Amino acid sequence: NFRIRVDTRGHLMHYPQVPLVNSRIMKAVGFEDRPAGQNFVVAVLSYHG
Amino acid sequence: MIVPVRCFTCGKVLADKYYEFKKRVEAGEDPGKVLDDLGVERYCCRRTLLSHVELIDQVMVYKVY
Amino acid sequence: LGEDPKDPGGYFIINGSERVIVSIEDLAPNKTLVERDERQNKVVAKVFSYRHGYRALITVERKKDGILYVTIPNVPKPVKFVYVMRALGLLTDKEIVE
Amino acid sequence: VAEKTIKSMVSKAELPDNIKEELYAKLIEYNEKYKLKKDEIQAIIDETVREYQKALIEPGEAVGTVAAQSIGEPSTQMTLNTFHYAGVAEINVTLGLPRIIEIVDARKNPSTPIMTVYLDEEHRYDRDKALEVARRIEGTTLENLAREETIDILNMEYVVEIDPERLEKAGLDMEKVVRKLTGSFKSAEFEAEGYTLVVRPKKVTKLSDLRKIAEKVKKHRLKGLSGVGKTIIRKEGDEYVIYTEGSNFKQVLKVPGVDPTRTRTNNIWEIAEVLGIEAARNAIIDEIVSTMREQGLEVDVRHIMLVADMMTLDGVIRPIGRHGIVGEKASVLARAAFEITTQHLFAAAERGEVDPLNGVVENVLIGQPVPVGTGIVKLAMSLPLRPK
Amino acid sequence: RVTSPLSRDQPHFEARDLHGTHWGRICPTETPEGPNCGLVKNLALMSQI
Amino acid sequence: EFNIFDHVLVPEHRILSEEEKEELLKKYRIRISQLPQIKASDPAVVALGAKPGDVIEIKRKSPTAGYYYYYRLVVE
Amino acid sequence: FRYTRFEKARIIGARALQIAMGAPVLIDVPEGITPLQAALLEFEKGVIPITVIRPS
Amino acid sequence: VCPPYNADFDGDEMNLHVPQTEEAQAEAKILMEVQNHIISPRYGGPLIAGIQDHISGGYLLTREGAYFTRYEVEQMLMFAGMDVNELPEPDKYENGEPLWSGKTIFSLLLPDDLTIWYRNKLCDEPERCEALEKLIEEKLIPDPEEVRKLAYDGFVYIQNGKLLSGAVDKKAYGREDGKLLDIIVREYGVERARQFLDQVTKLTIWVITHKGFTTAIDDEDLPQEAIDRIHEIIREAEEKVQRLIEAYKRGELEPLPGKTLEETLESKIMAVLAEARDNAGKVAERYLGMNNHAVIMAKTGARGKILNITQMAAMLGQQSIRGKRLYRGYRGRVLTHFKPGDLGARARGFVTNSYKSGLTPQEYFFHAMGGREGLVDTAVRTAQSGYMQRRLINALQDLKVDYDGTVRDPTGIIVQFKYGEDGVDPMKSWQGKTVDVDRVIVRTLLKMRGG
Amino acid sequence: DKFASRHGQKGVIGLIVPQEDMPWTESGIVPDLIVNPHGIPSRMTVGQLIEAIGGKVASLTGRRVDGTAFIGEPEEKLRKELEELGFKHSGREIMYDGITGRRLEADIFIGVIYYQRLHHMVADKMHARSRGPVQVLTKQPTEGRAREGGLRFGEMERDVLIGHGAAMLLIERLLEESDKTEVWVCESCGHLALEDKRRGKVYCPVCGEDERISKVEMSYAFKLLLDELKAMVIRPSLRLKDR
Amino acid sequence: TLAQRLKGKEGRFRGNLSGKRVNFSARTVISPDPMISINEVGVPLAVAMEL
Ligand SMILES: [Mg+2]
Ligand SMILES: [Zn+2]
Ligand SMILES: [Zn+2]
């Protein structure tokens, strides 16, 4: 119900995504039904500093 | 929040194969071949299609005129 | 109606802002706790007790010369345990002893 | 070229150089055994003076402020160490940041004192002789050689109890057993299995109140010298060093065998009354340094020496706050912004007093340039000035 | 949240340490840093009142 | 049997004759009352028999500049 | 006569302020320069006429 | 410039104010600029220097066998500001292809007269350092070919502007003591140092970037034989503790002098296990080679400690709280999963598994007790420090150094005849001493004799 | 803007480099976030490495790996499955550097880590003060972004500037950015004089005009402080001294 | 009254005299860039127009 609400400061991240590997508990709580974040694809190396 | 029409790393259209994916996987057809059976080679395109939530149907019900 | 089913509730909507009472961890009323040893005096016991709003402390200390005192909130000035015991309701020495 | 010929070239050049550099340079410049000839030797001395001449402090510095900040910065990075070391002798000496706070303040009392005792040329390499000294200073009453106390039944009235073996394996001197009646209050007599019993067959004073007898006889034992405590020995570089707990300076020097010229003591005050004031200054410096080195960090010695010298400026050592320098004389305004209570001490100055300025906080409150830094320079310039 | 009623500044070393009884009643890790640290704690997931 | 001397913490205090007072006081261009001031107690002054209104010359060793001098008075 | 660090800063600071309010400049031509940077080039050539009264 | 501010980069904020009046502005630029503060007044050493990538990249650039092809050399001298003419010359190795030894490219930065030699952290063979240590004393100028080309990787030897032997690590740059950046600011003013510092940074970065410096997950792996080696150590160390407990029960204790019997038992136990953890650490420093991308960071000094690399493939060790072992719990035990009255190794908080293999439920809870300790302390230690500093500032801020070299308080009471036991400023003195005769002799005698 | 994983690798976006100059793997993958390798074997977050491999296996297979504490997917299965899917077991690959273009002479790790954007966004931190409205009765600048304020120059900031020796810089910063009031002091009395408009002249109380009165510049704050002493029976004689 | 006016632990030394917020300033987050000289600082162009 974010679009019908009055609150001092709210946030809305456009495209959230379900986290690849998670915990079994997170599904039984309801975090998977309204998540908060995205899956990047990271490489580890030191670039130009 | 309807499926990202492009992937986030590899530029390739992807919305046109979301729906056809979902209904087929919700009948028992194993995901590891459905994705393969379509044009999804690298895994970078694959992550955005596997993990997504499409909340748009719940939010649409409420209105703001 | 206009609510989301995932909302668990448990808060008030006083004056617009959503206020919630965070539970406060008490120190077990109507109990007895024997305090430690040999810092300034000997051992002391402390008991919190509340009855209708007010909560007061009642220690029955015994400092290292055997006086054995009691603290009262209103005006510190400790009194001997046997002094206070007779002012309460036990007269004979056999009463206290037994 | 030889020894005597370079003891003169240095000599007439030593005027811009200092005393210490004279001894060091000659000794070292000699000790290079492939020894150069003459012309270059002059050049080295010529070069050396340039470095020294370039190292002096620029007059106008603010040595007070940088000394405070450099000592107050590592306190933030004062992390833990291996507090449970694999050592034995020194135990619970209160390291860390709270140690620094104790030395920066006066405090007659301080928590866990230790005094260090070295020994002369007979006790320096032998275990049996170091122990006799140690045993002579420990000092054991009667309330430590026991486990508890209770009373008896009818006429016995009291009893002394376990244990008795603290003399027949440690070696604490049966001759002094007879001594005990040295002006003692009561003192009965029953040395059976080494544990002296004490029977009192009397009256009205004590009957069974075994608590108040603490201040009596029980505390009044004296099985040793120097009413101080535990004594731990340690071989510190083939020398036995005696580490004692507590402190008792007046009577420790008057003990056979303790070398009086090398004992150092962690108690700041006791060193000032026995050794002297200047010796207290050295004790301040040494102690702060010791703390920093055992943490890893290092701080340059000139900062510590400034604070230590400045603190002993009256003869009597006084704390750095509220009872010392900020409380002592400054200008009247330099105590107005410190510990607001001032309405008894502030009105004191109202009876015959002046003030010029030249502080730091007075000039910043009034709008004048402070006398440190650039403020201490004055310019002058002749005014024809044809431009050309 | 479960809160304790003490002083936010003076150090209570014996009140902040994770006591053994917290197992299964109070979360061992969830504790916000700052001047509080240890005073405010969180209920474990598997605990009834 | 000991003394204030012969110890690794107390340096050798010595006293100046009357002449050197004026000579010293001209160099640093200062008044008499502006010097540090020991007390009439503490062994290092009473052993040498010093009177109030004196400038004791204390020479102490500093592990950086070698030999460094100082000057102090005595009051009650 | 070698300046100390504190005296150097002051001389520049004093000299720079004079250059703003008039006070003709020596050869210091290039292109548009602040009054501060003007004092730096003049000092680098050792032509600053301000002498330090030394207290001695 | 991010040791002096003590800043990191995870959101920390800084403010900037701009002075206005011409006297104030001038004063700020001459007296407070960054280059005048490379050495810190607290200790005699450089404060502004190379950090994490700057040190680690410097090692890869100067190891035995770092041959950079012609294209790369050319490309990187243009990345580091320096501006040379047609002298890359002359191609040390032309066997495979015409190419350049790593030492010569680094040598293009030091001025043409720096002679310095010092042992550094990466040495591991105190004999091979010493075989070369005599050939510098009794000759002072040899031919470079004989035994300097019989070089080691841990004995920095620079002679008249040429790095013959040695490798660069945290003994050249860095926030703690580095005796290369140190010497270059004393000998050759202040303005030179910033260019040498600046050009080293952009150089060292360009090699590290284009060369590849990742860490994977196999960097912490040990084979099956080494794993079994650690396991037998943990079994014996446990059984040693059990034997002492049985001795305590039967009253054959043999107790320590000072502490009481109950504390003697604990004192003996902690020493037994601390040896066993460190013994496992010696095994970890032995088997996994020095040529993977993780140990390299540990031995040079760029976010390293050999103690944590070993703590990722071996025992964690005991777990303590302010000294004593874990006692705070139920009436007779720590957790309710052990039997009442067990002072054994495993029961009283000793984790046996590492972070790779994974912690069990009992052990994981024990580790949390030791981690809250570090959290609480750090915020408390700051409180006492800040107040304490306010005391000493409001007591010493008045002192100045007069022109005759005398420190006087504002009432003319002379606090110190000849400042700081005269007369060298701590910002310019050599590790507590002054002028340093041992350095000046070697320096001037070498420049004249060498010609 | 601030980004941080769910393990504790807090960080700020450093540069938003064009897609072309980015090193890429001998396949079609182009990395999105390049993390400094000095942060993993320093903090000891082995869980970060395991999650990277775990996301790669999970994306290829198609099922979501279960990672709950203590009963999660055993470490050895993800490494043994990753190989049979067609990838070096260790997570590393051959990468080509996008700037020039040649393989790095090492293998470069790559994974699928779940990040999350935190709300400490730069739009709510940056603000500047030129010269704002201040208090009237106490005369100090205001606080916050809704009333245009930054931080203050109190106790510690004076002592640092004194340490350098910047006398001139000091004065400008702490006083001149307020009010400076000029008052006429009598030389032999010490008491503040008194004007009179319409005639245009000064006049101190005790001595009538003959005695040379002199101008003195001081901070308005200090003038009020003298008055408080003057309201009592204390006389603050200001004895001036010549240039 | 007067003795609570000049002092009373919160009067007019530490409150308004010896410490103030100042003018001509700015405050924001920092991010790295090793491609500028050791003494230079990058200032965002929005802040450059307000000072
Ligand atoms: Mg930070
Ligand atoms: Zn993709
Ligand atoms: Zn007048």
Curated annotation (Swiss-Prot), chain B:
- Give the record's cofactor note, including how many are bound: Binds 1 zinc ion.
Cofactor list: Zn(2+)
Q: What class of enzyme is it?
A: transferase
Chain sites annotated for binding Zn(2+): 7, 10, 44-45
Q: For this UniProt entry, what is the primary localization, expressed as one broad class?
A: cytoplasm
Pfam families with a match to the protein in the record: RNA_pol_N
- Gene Ontology, cellular component aspect: chromosome; cytoplasm; DNA-directed RNA polymerase complex
Question: Which GO biological process annotations does it have?
Answer: DNA-templated transcription
Protein's cellular compartments? Cytoplasm; Chromosome
Q: What keywords would UniProt list here?
A: Chromosome, Cytoplasm, DNA-directed RNA polymerase, Metal-binding, Nucleotidyltransferase, Transcription, Transferase, Zinc
* GO MF annotations, alphabetized: DNA binding; DNA-directed RNA polymerase activity; zinc ion binding
Catalyzed reaction equations: RNA(n) + a ribonucleoside 5'-triphosphate = RNA(n+1) + diphosphate
Q: What is its EC number?
A: 2.7.7.6
Q: How does it assemble?
A: Part of the RNA polymerase complex.
Q: What does this protein do?
A: DNA-dependent RNA polymerase (RNAP) catalyzes the transcription of DNA into RNA using the four ribonucleoside triphosphates as substrates.
Family (UniProt): Belongs to the archaeal Rpo10/eukaryotic RPB10 RNA polymerase subunit family.
Q: What is this protein called?
A: DNA-directed RNA polymerase subunit Rpo10
Curated annotation (Swiss-Prot), chain D:
Q: Is Transferase included in the keywords of this UniProt record?
A: yes
Q: Does the keyword Nucleotidyltransferase apply?
A: yes
- Keywords on record: Chromosome, Cytoplasm, DNA-binding, DNA-directed RNA polymerase, Nucleotidyltransferase, Transcription, Transferase
This entry carries the following GO cellular component terms, namely: chromosome; cytoplasm; DNA-directed RNA polymerase complex
Enzyme Commission number(s) from the entry: 2.7.7.6
Q: Name one GO molecular function term.
A: DNA-directed RNA polymerase activity
- Protein name from the UniProt record: DNA-directed RNA polymerase subunit Rpo1C
Q: Which organism is it from?
A: Thermococcus kodakarensis (strain ATCC BAA-918 / JCM 12380 / KOD1) (Pyrococcus kodakaraensis (strain KOD1))
GN (gene name): rpo1C
Curated annotation (Swiss-Prot), chain F:
Which reaction is recorded as catalysed by this protein?
Answer: RNA(n) + a ribonucleoside 5'-triphosphate = RNA(n+1) + diphosphate
Q: Which domain of life is it from?
A: Archaea
Q: In its UniProt record, which GO terms are filed under biological process?
A: DNA-templated transcription
What enzyme category does the UniProt record give? transferase
Query: What interactions and quaternary structure are annotated?
Result: Part of the RNA polymerase complex.
The protein's role, per its UniProt record: DNA-dependent RNA polymerase (RNAP) catalyzes the transcription of DNA into RNA using the four ribonucleoside triphosphates as substrates.
Q: What is this protein called?
A: DNA-directed RNA polymerase subunit Rpo5
From Swiss-Prot, chain G:
Q: Name one GO biological process term.
A: DNA-templated transcription
The protein's matches in Gene3D superfamilies, at most eight in alphabetical order, are given as: 3.90.940.10
Role this protein plays:
DNA-dependent RNA polymerase (RNAP) catalyzes the transcription of DNA into RNA using the four ribonucleoside triphosphates as substrates.
Location (main, coarse):
cytoplasm
**Subcellular localization(s) per the UniProt record:** Cytoplasm; Chromosome
* Gene giving rise to this polypeptide: rpo6
Q: Which reaction does it catalyse?
A: RNA(n) + a ribonucleoside 5'-triphosphate = RNA(n+1) + diphosphate
Keywords from the UniProt entry: Chromosome, Cytoplasm, DNA-directed RNA polymerase, Nucleotidyltransferase, Transcription, Transferase
Assembly behavior: Part of the RNA polymerase complex.
Q: Output the Gene Ontology terms for molecular function.
A: DNA binding; DNA-directed RNA polymerase activity
| Protein name, UniProt field | DNA-directed RNA polymerase subunit Rpo6
UniProt-listed PANTHER family: DNA-DIRECTED RNA POLYMERASE SUBUNIT K, DNA-DIRECTED RNA POLYMERASES I, II, AND III SUBUNIT RPABC2
For this record, the Gene Ontology CC terms, alphabetical, are: chromosome; cytoplasm; DNA-directed RNA polymerase complex
Q: Where are the transmembrane segments?
A: none
Enzyme class, top EC level, equals: transferase
The source organism is: Thermococcus kodakarensis (strain ATCC BAA-918 / JCM 12380 / KOD1) (Pyrococcus kodakaraensis (strain KOD1))
